[PDB]
Design a protein around this ligand. Structure first.
Ligand SMILES: [Cl-]
Ligand SMILES: [Cl-]
Ligand SMILES: [Cl-]
Ligand SMILES: [Cl-]
Ligand SMILES: [Cl-]
Ligand SMILES: [Cl-]
Ligand SMILES: [Cl-]
Ligand SMILES: [Cl-]
Ligand SMILES: [Cl-]
Ligand SMILES: [Cl-]
Ligand SMILES: [Cl-]
Ligand SMILES: [Cl-]
Ligand SMILES: [Cl-]
Ligand SMILES: [Cl-]
Ligand SMILES: [Cl-]
Ligand SMILES: [Cl-]
Ligand SMILES: [Cl-]
Ligand SMILES: [Cl-]
Ligand SMILES: [Cl-]
Ligand SMILES: [Cl-]
Ligand SMILES: [Cl-]
Ligand SMILES: [Cl-]
Ligand SMILES: [Cl-]
Ligand SMILES: [Cl-]
Ligand SMILES: [Cl-]
Ligand SMILES: [Cl-]
Ligand SMILES: [Cl-]
Ligand SMILES: [Cl-]
Ligand SMILES: [Cl-]
Ligand SMILES: [Fe+2]
Ligand SMILES: [Fe+2]
Ligand SMILES: [Fe+2]
Ligand SMILES: [Fe+2]
Ligand SMILES: [Fe+2]
Ligand SMILES: [Fe+2]
Ligand SMILES: [Fe+2]
Ligand SMILES: [Fe+2]
Ligand SMILES: [Fe+2]
Ligand SMILES: [Fe+2]
Ligand SMILES: [Fe+2]
Ligand SMILES: [Fe+2]
Ligand SMILES: [Fe+2]
Ligand SMILES: [Fe+2]
Ligand SMILES: [Fe+2]
Ligand SMILES: [Fe+2]
Ligand SMILES: [Mg+2]
Ligand SMILES: [Mg+2]
Ligand SMILES: [Mg+2]
Ligand SMILES: [Mg+2]
Ligand SMILES: [Mg+2]
Ligand SMILES: [Mg+2]
Ligand SMILES: [Mg+2]
Ligand SMILES: [Mg+2]
Ligand SMILES: [Mg+2]
Ligand SMILES: [Mg+2]
Ligand SMILES: [Mg+2]
Ligand SMILES: [Mg+2]
Ligand SMILES: [Mg+2]
Ligand SMILES: [Mg+2]
Lengths: 172, 172, 172, 172
């Protein structure tokens, strides 16, 4: 047993390892989306920048969970990072919709993690999740919803003008 | 009788109390409009900011009338602030139209207040209304008319692109 | 269903709407108290300033709950803001006592809201209440208790000198 | 006839001369009050400073009316400035009460002047009175009422401590 370990259930330790993988997966999805918008036949530079920033943020989310694992005396176990579901993301609107779906999936995992921490009476872990993750997810989901709404109202994905102007005025 | 009271008719005192309620009502209407534009399925952040600013301005209008009541030796009597007529404001254009209607209603009340102050030979109160309220209303009504005109010319409310671009270029 | 909504119970949504009304009510109570102290026959300018600041803070409390409702995909429903229980607040001491009672009532509502969020396993909402509301209420209640104690010890409300000096030295 | 005179009734001209005398009288009253508080057996230096400032303000009020008379093509006619009603002002409270009475008398004269300007259809003169005089009087009367209230609540004039502390904390 780690000399630092206290009130940290083996199930919580395992769940933190699963969450690390999921954050790394999210980072990879956003990386793929970013460079789709950098293609010469897509060419929306602010969509590209927005998703690259999201990719780097997800890596930070993963790193903070790795730090947490060690803080509590658990042991990090890494798994393959699966490639994203798509190679071609179709449009700005479709990428935003996929990002919304992704962030809601990550949120669901965090809520399950919090339920586990609650069941194991781990208030430090509950506070960690609430402080660093739960409101971040609510904000991310709200922002993506807002973006999807605007793109739809403007006439995307059929209107290339809509996506062009959104790229300039919202993401620029 | 208040030691400060001079040339201040009981009818004017009552009318000032009614105007206080109306300004607080206007503040509440604009508060409701603001957060409508903050909904994830509406998502026009500059419409939201514009109406929130208007809400706070209306509170200032109410506070200055409360100060006036006390300056003249009248006594403030508050009433319930009625909820706004709508929960859902439909569109940027419709909210602007409702705001125009509201500001013209507030103006009519101020004009009736001025008629009363004139009838009671209260030049201090006439000057107060003219200085702090009447031109403010004319400017507010002109601005809202201008906004409604632009939104109509651009193709709102049917064009979500129109409202999006107005949000960016006029309210941004 | 709102595209952003996740783990947000209809009961929690309704309770947030009730809390919005209560914060707006508190704002109105403090507004009334403020201008009582601005009367020529009361004339305690720092009591007036203190309560006006509290009024504006309560509006901020309401606005943050409106933002929360939209962040979570709920829908804001507004109700009349009831007038305060009193027109005449009697004295500095009595206003402070009424403010103490008000803040404890608001705290009780927030605690009931937290119980509901707990029962519905909504850790985001629990954290929101704890972070932005619960310690604010504890601090507000402690400050008002301190004020009431000092006013009583000094000889209020019978001593107009006590209230005068408290206005200068504590609220100034 | 003065080459500048236009829409300026002889009655208005005469009334402006009477108002000039009244403002000079008010200046003299405040001068007398000021030095009462400078007596070694009274010795309230901030009461003295407050009333001296009021004395100089009243002279400014007179000078602006003299300027107005010439602006409109009327001719200034000066009369004796009567000495104040009292030599001994008794107390801080009594001086404040006499100042309140004085400012209400000056206000009544200004209201009569405005009635005359209205009857003679002189909108320039009406605006002059409203802009430079009427709200100044309302503010002055409110301030003096506030002062009287505080002094009474504190226990003046019998409490020399009350007047001492008011001198320090309100007028200091
Ligand atoms: Cl352990
Ligand atoms: Cl274990
Ligand atoms: Cl895994
Ligand atoms: Cl693996
Ligand atoms: Cl726990
Ligand atoms: Cl947000
Ligand atoms: Cl937030
Ligand atoms: Cl454009
Ligand atoms: Cl009156
Ligand atoms: Cl009357
Ligand atoms: Cl009313
Ligand atoms: Cl009512
Ligand atoms: Cl009049
Ligand atoms: Cl204008
Ligand atoms: Cl203008
Ligand atoms: Cl839900
Ligand atoms: Cl539900
Ligand atoms: Cl309610
Ligand atoms: Cl209602
Ligand atoms: Cl929970
Ligand atoms: Cl505290
Ligand atoms: Cl604290
Ligand atoms: Cl003439
Ligand atoms: Cl004439
Ligand atoms: Cl004379
Ligand atoms: Cl003479
Ligand atoms: Cl006229
Ligand atoms: Cl004032
Ligand atoms: Cl003023
Ligand atoms: Fe993210
Ligand atoms: Fe960031
Ligand atoms: Fe993440
Ligand atoms: Fe994320
Ligand atoms: Fe306005
Ligand atoms: Fe403004
Ligand atoms: Fe207004
Ligand atoms: Fe308005
Ligand atoms: Fe408060
Ligand atoms: Fe504050
Ligand atoms: Fe509050
Ligand atoms: Fe509060
Ligand atoms: Fe004066
Ligand atoms: Fe001055
Ligand atoms: Fe004067
Ligand atoms: Fe004066
Ligand atoms: Mg996984
Ligand atoms: Mg595979
Ligand atoms: Mg937080
Ligand atoms: Mg009304
Ligand atoms: Mg109703
Ligand atoms: Mg004017
Ligand atoms: Mg003006
Ligand atoms: Mg309620
Ligand atoms: Mg009622
Ligand atoms: Mg905290
Ligand atoms: Mg005279
Ligand atoms: Mg004589
Ligand atoms: Mg006029
Ligand atoms: Mg003015």
């Amino acid at each position: 047993t780690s000399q630092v370990r206290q009130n940290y259930h083996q199930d919580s330790e395992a769940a933190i390892n699963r969450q690390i993988n999921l954050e790394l997966y999210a980072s990879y999805v956003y990386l793929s989306m970013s460079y789709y918008f950098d293609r010469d036949d897509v060419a929306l530079k602010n969509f590209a920048k927005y998703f690259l920033h999201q990719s780097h943020e997800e890596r930070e989310h993963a790193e903070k969970l790795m730090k947490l694992q060690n803080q509590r005396g658990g042991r990090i176990f890494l798994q393959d990072i699966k490639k994203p579901d798509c190679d071609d993301w179709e449009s700005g609107l479709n990428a935003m919709e996929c990002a919304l779906h992704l962030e809601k999936n990550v949120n669901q995992s965090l809520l399950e993690l919090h339920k586990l921490a609650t069941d194991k009476n781990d208030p430090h872990l509950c506070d960690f999740i609430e402080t660093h993750y739960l409101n971040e997810q609510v904000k991310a989901i709200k922002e993506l919803g807002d973006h999807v709404t605007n793109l739809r109202k403007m006439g995307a994905p059929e209107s290339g003008l809509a996506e062009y102007l959104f790229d300039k005025h919202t993401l620029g």
